[PDB]
Amino acid sequence: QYQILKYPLTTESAMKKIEDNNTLVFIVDLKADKKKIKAAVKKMYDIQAKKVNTLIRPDGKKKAYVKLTPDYDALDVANKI
Amino acid sequence: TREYTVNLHKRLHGCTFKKKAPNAIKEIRKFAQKAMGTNDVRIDVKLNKHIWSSGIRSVPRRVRVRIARKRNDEEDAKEEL
Amino acid sequence: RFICIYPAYLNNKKTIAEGRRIPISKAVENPTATEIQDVCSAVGLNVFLEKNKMYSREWNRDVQYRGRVRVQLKQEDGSLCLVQFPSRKSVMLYAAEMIPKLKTRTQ
Amino acid sequence: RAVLFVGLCDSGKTLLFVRLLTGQYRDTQTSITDSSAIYKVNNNRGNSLTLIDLPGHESLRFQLLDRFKSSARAVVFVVDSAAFQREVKDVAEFLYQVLIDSMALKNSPSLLIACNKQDIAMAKSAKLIQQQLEKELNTLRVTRSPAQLGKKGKEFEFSQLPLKVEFLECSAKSADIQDLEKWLAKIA
Amino acid sequence: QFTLRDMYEQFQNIMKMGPFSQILGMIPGFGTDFMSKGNEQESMARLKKLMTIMDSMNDQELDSTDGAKVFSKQPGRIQRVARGSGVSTRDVQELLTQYTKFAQMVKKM
């Protein structure tokens, strides 16, 4: 069975999104969509997902931009990994 | 460092008229190279503008050029007067 | 109390001041402390090789160029070990002559 | 110390020299050697200077300027103001060497350009002679076939020189040498 | 531009501030076990030996934009430096390689 989340995407752009818009970026698989990404994220990091935006690639994976609630706020969630 | 009157422009009539300006620029370079053995041929933009004043086709018959030699190796730096 | 024999002593490629002790006519190409010991030990001479010692007038630091050889001339009582070997010159020369014969050189 | 009078032939060196020493006129011929004499200055202390008149002939001018230059407290370069227009190039060329010689000296002598023969009608003014000489020395420092004149990138002018340089007008024919005796007093 | 003389000078400054060394151990921010043990005496003796090798070099080699290059084109120079400093040919090439790595990072600094 395949897992939803693959690994965090760490990049300059992902950092700006974390710091300034408070979102988290992940590599998931291709067909997780989008609900599944939202749920998976919650249950893994104990947070409230407000929205998910998804893109196929190219990489052969899928990228999900997951924005969290303001009280969750995100710099911290990412710091523990 | 001395002031010199470049004809050789007269020679530029031996080339068709729509291209006299580039021929001019070459003649000035060769004039100052010659007389003036110790003279490299950097042409300050002022000279270029002088020749191109009435467009590519209508170069003057003469230009007065102020030129300077430094002595060692043979350079020359040359401008309009 | 043994004596000292540095390859510089037997080197025909060295000048006087560079450490040559025998006439060029008798000197040798590039004697190695090893070869020196190998010909001395094979004549009945008591000798040991000081592999790492280096001759003071030897600017080079390579191997073929270093080492020292020690031979016993007299015996504690005084008698020479081998009548045919009074002096040091005697050994140097004897060596200079026998090395160009070592199989390893005629090869 | 010595005051050297130099200049082209016929500029009036010997007559000025005579006028300064006697107040009179005298006939002269082209000079073939230098002549000298003591001059008591017009100021209170009345300092004495040794005026030295040097031949202007090309074959003698530099040989004698070299011989006396290190003894000079001052140099008076005499110019025929009436013949200036035709002689400009010859004047500038000689002055050039005089400027150079003067600067290469430990204690540079003070230098005057005496625009003589003003009594003649067609005489160019000292102002105009200075102007044309600057323009001319300006070309000479380039064409001249290491001490140099002023700054290479700026048009030559006497003020750029590491030397006291003055211009005045005069006439050796009594004469009109008031300013000259004033200057000689001033530099004594 | 990091020359061999520049490296020589940095080595002088580092050795100089070595003793000193007590005060440096009395300042926080250097993590746990700052300078313990104990390899500061041996480490400095090393820099000094490299300095003695550069003492056998000349001004051209020392002020060259790339001192390692001056020895690549004229390997005879390597032999001289080694003779004068009582060191081996390999030791001089080692210093040269180290200088190369040092200068690389200095421009990367």
């Binding site: 069975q1 897992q3 693959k6 690994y7 965090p8 760490t10 893994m44 990994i81 | - | - | - | -």
Partner: protein, 64 residues
């Protein structure tokens, strides 16, 4: 490797699940490290996957 098939069958239904959720965690942390470049030891992040597969296979064979 470090976890054999016999040992998986040895374990109780509850121990497989506990072992399962354990392997997942090791995996998740390996992927985090790999994020975030992972210190390691490639042979294991691969073994973690196969281990998990075996457990699931056994859970199925045994009926949980």
């Amino acid at each position: 490797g470090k976890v054999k098939a016999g040992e998986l069958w040895n374990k109780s239904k509850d121990d497989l699940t506990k072992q399962l959720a354990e392997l997942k965690t090791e995996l998740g942390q390996l992927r985090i490290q790999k994020v975030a470049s992972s210190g390691s030891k490639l042979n294991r992040i691969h073994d973690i996957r196969k281990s998990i597969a075996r457990v699931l296979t056994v859970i199925n064979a045994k009926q949980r």
